[model samples]
Target: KGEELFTGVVPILVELDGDVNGHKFSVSGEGEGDATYGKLTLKFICTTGKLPVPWPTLVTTLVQCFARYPDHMKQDFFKSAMPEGYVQERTIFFKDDGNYKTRAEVKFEGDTLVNRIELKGIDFKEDGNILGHKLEYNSSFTESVLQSQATELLQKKAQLVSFKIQGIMKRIFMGANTLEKFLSDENSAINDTLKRRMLSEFLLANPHVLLVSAIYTNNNERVITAMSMDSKIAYPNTTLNENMTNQIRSLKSITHSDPYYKEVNGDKIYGMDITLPLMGKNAIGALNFFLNIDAFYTDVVGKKKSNTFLMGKDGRLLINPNREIQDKILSAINPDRRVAKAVEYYNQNEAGTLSYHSLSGNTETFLAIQPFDFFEEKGNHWRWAIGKYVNKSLVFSSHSNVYITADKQKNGIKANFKIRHNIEDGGVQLADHYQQNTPIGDGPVLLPDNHYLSTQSKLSKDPNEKRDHMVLLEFVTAAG
Candidate 1:
């Protein structure tokens, strides 16, 4: 009945005692939409007239019942097996053997009994005497097991998120590179019908890109040609915007900006500017691509619980969903002061995740840092960082309170100290070869480390040689 219950199937858990004492069921189902079903078990209370059957015999009987009328029970059959007045609760089983399970409870609501279901797991349904087979069951101690399983599950998902995000960035880089390469053709003309034809085709091919513009300027760097998709600009040439103008005037061979907000004819637009110089026999201009910030985040990052974003080589907040409070966040306060520390820390190890207290917001956060070199030019550096808060509930599934803090380092942010019940140890590890005092010559010198599990490398500094930057991700499982 909600987003949480649709599309992909979710696991569920169920436990029943009383009317059907000692009966446990584990199953999975699609929460809603057409039809969903999973195994259901019912251990009927004996009527003194008939004795209960063996476990294997009971399993065979229920399997036969389901095979006979699989379609008869389309949603669930757990509550239907239990009589009136039963107690049940539902929670997620973070880790499992890939077997789907769910929980359902029946309750009365103003003269009508209702079947309310969430998700969880089970063992099976069997029949026996009241005390024939006694098994130790702990109704009081369940949190520890669930917490550990949940942590392991999230750590796995976080690792996958790192790789998936890197792939998305690489694809965007390729699209921009393709546009730059096509515009660089020696025979390409200014305002030539063929040039516009090719540019529109390229733009249409990449629906993710909001606009692709060619800003031509003389040696004086005055705008001569400015064009993008007809609907892209507020006006044909007037919407070139200051970001493009500033990029062209800077004269950098390749340049990309942190995401920022701009108002185009009253509509607020968040975007990033990527520019490359267009060399020609006479006039020279810059090729600029405006990527829609909303589209880029939605299409690239998807809907994830943790935070993932792009940063200026410095630590500037770019494309974080939570950071967008107004139509625009003032750039002066947008960059996290801790970015320089993070950059310095990464220079020693090339790429890795850093856990730190966010200075901007004063909250404990996990920062997964990577050097992004999507362009061909030297001295152009960008950092792609993904992170989430390190609260107690994330690391362990214990009712016990957990407190975490960032340990400040001379050069960079380092390990996080997680404390539960006044005991402390390293909850997460940081790559720590580079010192804060040492001089980082140009960029971080990447050294290979096998301990880290998730990583991706692309866009070599020297295509002829082999100096490339890589993104490394490691799940901090020490707390587990």
Candidate 2:
């Protein structure tokens, strides 16, 4: 049972039967005075997956259309103004003939039409007819568009990363429990030998699994089943070393491990082990399985191109993802500003963002961190942090001479940026408090200034004015 869930930008939603302030509307047609200031919606009542609408642009098209229609459509698309703070709630529906369907919900904030989506639990089987063609969350064209300002995709990055990590953790423990339960079960087979054979099949149900064996207190130090990812059946290929035996003997419960490299087939393949106690009749052993480390991390963070990874509190990467950032990571060494900043931020909070201008260049470093706290219960405090580092000039940046300081604080990262402007170009001098050897800012109150504006409009040029220049054609304004 696999299900994909993530909020995404879908095609523009044509209104189905719905009411706003007592006025009813339908997909059949639009009435006069209907406002078109809506984003792609997510309000599928019983059916229909409101797919992509080429959003961020459709909102603009709606604006242009709204403006063109006399006095805001001069009709009753929405017969009256939606009172401020009142939400325009509506149900969305559609039929996908190929056996499965998708769902969505749309919400608009009064006149502004500030909308949100809560689409989940979608069962996408085959290429059901959402668009009469094919439908997919990772469809080539769909992904390309959402990757672009699907802020939903960006905003939920941490949670997705966390979700994958936790999902894998659960799987690891579940697998361990499976082996332990079978061995511990009093009624399962009359003998450990028969039970071990059954589990060996599952162990070899395999690739990315190197071996499955029982290390027990009994003198049966004989390897139960040893198999590699390749080959039909593998010969017993391990000798319980002194350190390995002690660790297993000492482990009272299941133990998970960090990834380590071991050469197999002349390639250094990453591997880690999970061991759980086997308390079967007349024997005490550990049910253990070795997993491909690269496979585990890659499954959580994805393949080579991923920007996410888990790291130590000391800022050492748990696994160096396949990326050029290593070129910089290797050169930075320890206690470097960026490294320490990341380390500090990870320890300071559960999930937050850190951004700063690089000491080296114009590019900025934006680090997003979410705690990898699953191991905490295993006495693995500060085991890891989920993180991604982005360095680029096109990121959020301020003009003028600005000194920005973001510190890890109680609530999250608090940033203070001071900008200085030249007096010659109608600019004011920097504030005196900001012009010190150490700039001064007071108090710890959270003063959030997070208003945002994203808008689009059609042409601004006056057709009556024959000539057009850069200023006239592009500089003038339009009714938003």
Candidate 3:
């Protein structure tokens, strides 16, 4: 009889699927330590460079990045869910002047919006145009609309996937006026035990959140409170620091945060927050929101099978593929010969399309840029863009193919490879291997257990041709 083996408590596992260019990047791992602190051991395994396979395309028929560009072009799933007030038609603005002073005191007693104010004979703005508002807000109506639009984008149900709902929270909204009152040194039964349920449910449509203090001059003092299913704690005693009182007074009222990041459950998470002045006195501020650029990039482009990203009106790029060749594509820049003209369309900040051939002339791209949302007080200029990249062929080139044949050989395996493509400049190297194996090789080209016959080809702008050729040299060995 052999010795018995038993397993330990299975560590929690997290996974995310993404793409580098057209290749598949699947990362999975289980972290250690605690939620507030930890290290990770999950490996980034770029399993395979997607072969231009057809049969599998049918399996992923309606999913992926860059490759499925056409379908999303027809009906962008992300734009469908878009946010509540982000889109033009869906946004319903209330009167800050007149009867509604934006001061009427937004209340939440039982996690239900209090003061069911009537809009019987008022006019409000929708989609940048004035629309009469004489009806009560039907939240159910809004939810259904958002749900339907979100359905296609959601594609596979959360039921089918189980990535940790990491990050701080989802759908966080608190009335700025209420926060002002709470933070004004007055005691609060609002954040008390019974109402903590209200606070928790209010912040969590099904997520988490913290009531923090950029509002309070608490440089050393962080007035942070979290709401959770098991939470029974009260809001900690917090004093409005003199610094932040003037801090709010001096606030730009409409400002955005720098992009931030951290590894959560082994996922690279990037987020930013946008702040807007509340609707009342003291410039207490009406609304502020946390924007998950990672999720934004995923929904619109990564998961939708479209190559997508968020950009500034200035065309500053955000969120990109982490593996493979790092293009360091900071912004859409000019192409070769001054022919593409280094068009500066994004500077206009209007919504439309931007098309250009790669500066090196190897790739051509058609990008659809749309203004996703903007603040009323600030420039209406947050741009969301997606693109389609194409390659060209005109002269002096034939389809080059690299064939690799690997078989068990004496002492070790031999990689017999050859190229059929015509390239002006190219090189091959060996890399990607399992660490520390018996040394084996041919002549001076020493090799180990795991190895990649990585190669790259390129043709500079000589005469009339320019192309950034693909690097084809990934061979899998069990040692890896």
Candidate 4:
């Protein structure tokens, strides 16, 4: 009977991982109504602190707030799979820009409140730049704590705990240019296959055929290039000295380039407007969190262009500027930081599992940099993954590439990203010119699309506000 009872009671767990710098928090009671905005009180669990309270405390407070909000509680962005109490009817939101200027909000049962509460934006640029934090959170002017210590510094923010793929990662394979009709037409199968299949297969055969992924806009076309070089000597080549070039070249790493595009009958056309990832490490850059690169999309005419690059085991760099023409070129190059991460991830990737790591770094400021004990294996499962990574000292992932759109209707120019890597030889080639080789098959990529509120106790003040929380927090994110 005991065994049967234990089996019958499946366990559900809630994992909240973040640094609070020692500010203790808690939610002791449950909502008291017909399931709407019931009278619920939040318990400080433990408090009496200053502005820069412990990072963990602040993170816990916000997450607790999420549990109280309808939208956040309904979605499962915080865990591997959907939890028991999540409401499917709610919508979730994250800031467009990865910076802390954005706040996660929730709705509960409230008469005067907007049914939503947003932690007013705080200047976290320094926190992110100095300590690797990109997001922050704190109780606002509307609320205050009982502690004598300034609660203002306790203002919460999302720490750059980990590297993010951004929403743009999905946009890469989404086939935005082609409409359902063009793709579904039975008669156009052969022609369509020749165009898309040919491009896909050719690219597969030559993984490094693409130099940059570009997006095209209407009227103007822009290309954002990621160069694997030191920013110290970023001036044009004409004035650069050999010593500076060599110094810059030494730091030159793999760079990612982005292009703009619009959708055609079913394909994307290239437009203009290129953006690069923010630079700085361990929370020292303002725009380091997640850049909203896709906001530039305007129409179908501007389609994204694909240019792939390949790296060799010996660190050689290969570039393919044009896939259709299949041209090739060789030159000296440098590798970037993410390239190292890919290598590390690849090394640690076991047969059927993803290696997790802690987002640990500068823990000096209010920006939560959850102190990852060298051997502390406790906390949320995801936190364990983060901790493992932190223990390995891979706080950032560099040497990766970005995507862009390309098309003639939008812009007739082909601008490419100048990259740097530590390779025996440096060479850039066009798609058709690349050596024929089979590309690896596609595999599933999992990631979070938004934030989670977790439970009824954590849901915000307005029931109607709960409808806006959306998330992709499932095993293989429902939308991933």
Best by TM-score: 2
The better candidate by TM-score, 2 or 3, is 2
Q: Model 2: what TM-score?
A: 0.44
Q: State in Å the error of residue 454, model 2.
A: 40
**Residue 474 local lDDT, model 4:** 9
> Candidate 3, TM-score vs. the true structure?
0.35
* Span of 10 residues, lowest total lDDT, candidate 1: 59-68
Candidate numbers sorted by lDDT from highest down? 2, 1, 3, 4
Cα lDDT of model 2 by residue, 240-292, tens digit: 77777756666676666655665766777666676777763334668888766
Query: What are the per-residue Cα lDDT tens digits for candidate 3 across 1-480?
Result: 000000111122323343222333333322221111011112111224332211111111100000111222222211121111011001112233111111111122231212111112123233211122222111113224643344333323321221122221222333433443444432334334433443344344423222222233323333333322234423445455566465555664456676555343355545565554433343432233345555544533446453444444344455444322122233434422222221243444344444444432234344444433333224544333232222233221211221222223332222322323111233221111111111122222112332332222221122331221121111111111
Residue 139 lDDT in model 1? 13
Total clashes in model 3, counting residue pairs 3 or more apart in sequence or in different chains? 7
Across 408-448, the per-residue lDDT of candidate 1 in tens digits comes to 23211111112111111223111111101111122222121
Model 4, 109: alpha-carbon shift in Å? 41
As for lDDT, the candidate ahead, 1 or 3, is 1
lDDT of 4 by residue, 1-480 (tens): 111111111221122222222322221112111112111222221222223222221221232211212433333221211121111111111122111211222222221111111222232232322123321221112222422122222221111221221122324323222322232233423352243443343223322123122211212222221111222111111232345333322332212223233342354433222222222221110100111222222110024532122211222221123333211211112111222343332224211111222211211111111111111122211110111111122221111121111223322111111111111133221111001111112222112233321121121233242222211110101111
Model 4 has an lDDT value of 0.21
Question: What TM-score goes with each of the models?
Answer: 0.40, 0.44, 0.35, 0.14
How much does candidate 4 score in TM-score?
0.14
* Model 3 spans with C-alpha error above 4 angstroms: 1-199, 206-214, 217-222, 227-246, 262-268, 276-289, 302-304, 320-344, 359-361, 374-480
